[PDB]
Design a protein around this ligand. Structure first.
Ligand SMILES: Nc1nc2c(ncn2[C@@H]2O[C@H](COP(=O)(O)OP(=O)(O)O)[C@@H](OP(=O)(O)OP(=O)(O)O)[C@H]2O)c(=O)[nH]1
Ligand SMILES: Nc1nc2c(ncn2[C@@H]2O[C@H](COP(=O)(O)OP(=O)(O)O)[C@@H](OP(=O)(O)OP(=O)(O)O)[C@H]2O)c(=O)[nH]1
Ligand SMILES: [Mg+2]
Lengths: 483, 482
């Protein structure tokens, strides 16, 4: 199925995602939208029976979601329901009510499945292979233990923002009564880990709060790293704030009644799991349901050296991948020939190779400032499987091709673990020289290094490359000659 | 599908690869150059082509052939200009090229060269009438355009490299070159308030003016220059030393030719009584292509066709259904609300294009999709649009469902830009149009009852109703569904 729509009927909101499959492993999120139905509204005081008005709202919203799915020419519609519907004595009635109204066939999924799908997404679409997911929802909280890309255990707890809200916070009971309740369920988590994968809207909201609190330069939620110990106190503080204080931190109006109880869950879980680093995730159950279908024969895992966002990016903007692969190859050969001089850690080949593939991607938009554009595409769309540093490095190499990288760059200094300015100049220089030598259809290039002289061997004239040699920015005094 | 054009100029050899994405849709896929300068030292020998510049030219064009093939060109159009057409050994140099790489150079005369420039400026600029100024290495072409149709063609024998090696390399008084250029410019039989600057010299000078004023948009095409106001500065360029030119941003390879070129421009501008010069990023190369693409259309695009807008949609909006609906509702809401915002009907032009392209950037990422859209618009919506057009459309898309900041740089890029309250109105209308078009609902009808917009429809419009609070209204305004 080329175009696949995924509908997620949660306890707090109703969400829709349209996925487009560009190649075997290539895909990208084509369209997203939401509705704040909150089908669980007022149900926790009546044994989880879905009330009449929320069901009417859910039907009206799900009917237009079906319309949206069809105008995108969807070949497959996967619809799932979670905690609030799971627990509802009248779940069958609501499922059949939706089918009669718009045709959608809701598939109620158990709390373990809900946890599994989240783990599948994080294990394939994040830049770390080991850790525990934390998917705080309206009615339940899921956790999936992941070790080296494989899911080793799963837990589902019956604590949730709207559940805690309607049980304790709307009755204005002391928070310690709501805190105790959550701890009693969190104790049922049989694992610990230094890493955490933050999943769900509540955590995306708290992630935005911190991104604002630290003036983060990169405006991408997926991959955002959060020191758990340093911010644990700040997260608990959010619980006791009034509505006006939450607005000043950036919390949307529609999250004001739920984020307080949400922060409380997250703070109790972070303490129990002994987390020290939480990575914000932008994917969850929705993406998991899709990946479970996409990677049916590959054990729900991507083959090694297969990144979905890198591939789909080339599928969308580089259908003719021939030129970009030669540039990448020459980047490796030069990196090796020059290794005695630059002594750069081999780990940056990863970033240099990708920069070579994508250096000219931006030409699809304009040949002028093309590298600027490619750097723009990279920083904003190269998400799955890359850290924010990985984007920054890859971004800068392409951006400053044939140019000198300034010393006051905001992105280059986003962290102390970033490579030196000399390393970036070295890498970008290599990229630049490679682009010049691949301008023609030259083959069998060989490079040799002497004390300080790079010698380029080839049977071709390489007239243009030779003419363009002055306009390269060298990292150090260096001589370049053509045999 | 893919057409390459090779321009054998007097100062440089140029290669451009064009991709045709539809009937009228095209975009420049790749470009490069070589500084062969085949005319080096030719003006002393009545135009004879020297050996070294010919061997360099052969080597370069042979690799321009290699490039054209690896881009899968079905057509390779090659033209030669002044320096090559004035030589006594033209036929021989053309033979060595065809021998060495298989290219068939077509020598074109001055009239033909002015035409190709006029064809490009007549189709790819945001003004319909004016005079082109194509200052090259050995000639200066001028075409008269009236309502997009070419009326007269003239070719002058003044050029950068020419004026350089005849006057400026010999360290004589500048007034001698000005007199020579004046006597040759007098041949121009027309005048006009609009001039279209073409060629690398003028692009280099425009780049200098942009830096001087700290311009916020980094696109050359469509840059407007006040001729009277900037004439004196252009004249001063002539008397500057190279180190002074470097601080102005002039690259090394233009240092030897920008002074003579500046002098030519100051005389042409003065003689044509030019009031507005529009920098053109397109020239002879684009004319050759448009001549082949618009062969059955009298070398001009229909007066409803923008090849930039189109190509931008061919590249990123193959399925055009949703966008056309949003545009339609943008017009209806605009007219229905006119008693409240009282905005000049000329701004419908922008709101409609913003409505077509508001969601374009979703092909890069659904997150921050509207910003991506603005980025595309501001950097690639070039042919047939002014910079203000770009700026306005860019801002409408960018700040959908948002409040436009008061200190926005693009909003203040000019004093003629619309007010912030106007931009807020258009952005708000776009936003409402987007919500009402989310589903496939039809037959929307609007009525205004003293600040009350009433949206009439038979469909539930559930989602549109729920999203209403997230709109940023430009003024206190009531909106209700019937
Ligand atoms: N799943 C997911 N969502 C993302 C990601 N990045 C951003 N979003 C969400 O998409 C919506 C758009 O936020 P922006 O990207 O800043 O675009 P916008 O503000 O101009 O509307 C927001 O949801 P919202 O309107 O604040 O409501 P909510 O969905 O956050 O509860 C935002 O939190 C991501 O990586 N993954
Ligand atoms: N024909 C045309 N050219 C444009 C246009 N816009 C920019 N250019 C030229 O393209 C080349 C790329 O310079 P930039 O656009 O700044 O991109 P870059 O700095 O990263 O190389 C420059 O030519 P250059 O390297 O300075 O040498 P030259 O070709 O200008 O003489 C620039 O003047 C345009 O609209 N039309
Ligand atoms: Mg959920």
């Amino acid at each position: 199925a080329k175009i696949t729509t995924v509908i997620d009927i949660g306890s707090n909101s109703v969400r829709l995602a349209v996925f487009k499959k560009t190649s075997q492993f290539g895909f990208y999120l084509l369209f997203e939208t939401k509705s704040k139905v909150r089908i669980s509204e007022g149900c926790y005081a009546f044994n989880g029976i879905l009330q009449e008005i929320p069901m009417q709202r859910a039907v009206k919203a799900l009917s237009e979601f079906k319309e949206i799915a069809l105008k995108y020419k969807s070949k497959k519609i996967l619809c799932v329901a979670t905690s609030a519907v799971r627990d509802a004595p009248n779940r069958l009635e609501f499922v059949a009510r939706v089918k009669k109204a718009c045709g959608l066939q809701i598939k109620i999924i158990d709390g373990q499945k809900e946890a599994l799908y989240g783990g599948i997404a994080c294990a394939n679409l994040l830049h770390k292979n080991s850790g525990i997911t934390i998917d705080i929802g309206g009615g339940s909280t899921a956790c999936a233990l992941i070790e080296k890309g494989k899911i080793k255990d799963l837990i589902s707890l019956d604590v949730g923002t709207i559940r805690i809200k309607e049980m304790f916070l709307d009755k204005d009971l002391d928070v310690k009564l709501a805190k105790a309740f959550i701890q009693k369920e969190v104790s049922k988590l049989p694992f610990k880990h230094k890493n955490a994968f933050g999943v769900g809207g509540t955590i995306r909201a708290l992630s935005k709060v911190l991104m604002k609190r630290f003036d983060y330069p990169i405006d991408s939620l997926h991959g955002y790293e959060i020191d758990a110990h340093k911010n644990l106190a700040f997260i608990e503080k959010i619980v006791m704030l009034k509505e006006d204080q939450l607005r000043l931190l950036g919390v949307n109006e529609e999250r004001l009644d739920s984020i307080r109880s949400g922060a409380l869950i997250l703070s109790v879980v972070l303490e129990h799991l002994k987390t020290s680093l939480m990575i914000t995730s932008g994917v969850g159950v929705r993406e998991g349901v899709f990946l479970s279908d996409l990677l049916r024969n590959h054990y729900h895992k991507f083959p090694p050296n297969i990144n979905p966002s890198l591939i789909s990016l080339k599928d969308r903007f580089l259908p003719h991948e021939k030129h970009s692969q030669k540039v990448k190859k020459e980047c490796v050969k030069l990196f090796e020939a020059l290794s005695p001089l630059h002594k750069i850690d081999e780990k940056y080949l990863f970033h240099l190779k990708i920069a070579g593939e994508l250096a000219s991607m931006g030409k699809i938009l304009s040949v002028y400032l093309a590298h600027k554009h490619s750097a723009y595409f990279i920083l904003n769309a190269l998400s799955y499987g890359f850290s924010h540093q990985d984007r920054a490095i890859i971004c800068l190499l392409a951006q400053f091709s044939h140019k000198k990288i300034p010393k006051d760059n905001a992105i280059a200094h986003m962290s102390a673990m970033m490579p030196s300015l000399l390393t970036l100049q070295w890498l970008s220089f290599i990229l630049s020289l490679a682009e010049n030598l691949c301008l023609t259809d030259s083959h069998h290039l060989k490079y040799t290094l002497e004390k300080n002289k790079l010698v380029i061997h080839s049977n071709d004239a390489l007239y243009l490359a030779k003419e363009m040699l002055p306009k390269l920015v060298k990292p150090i005094p260096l001589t370049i000659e053509f045999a």
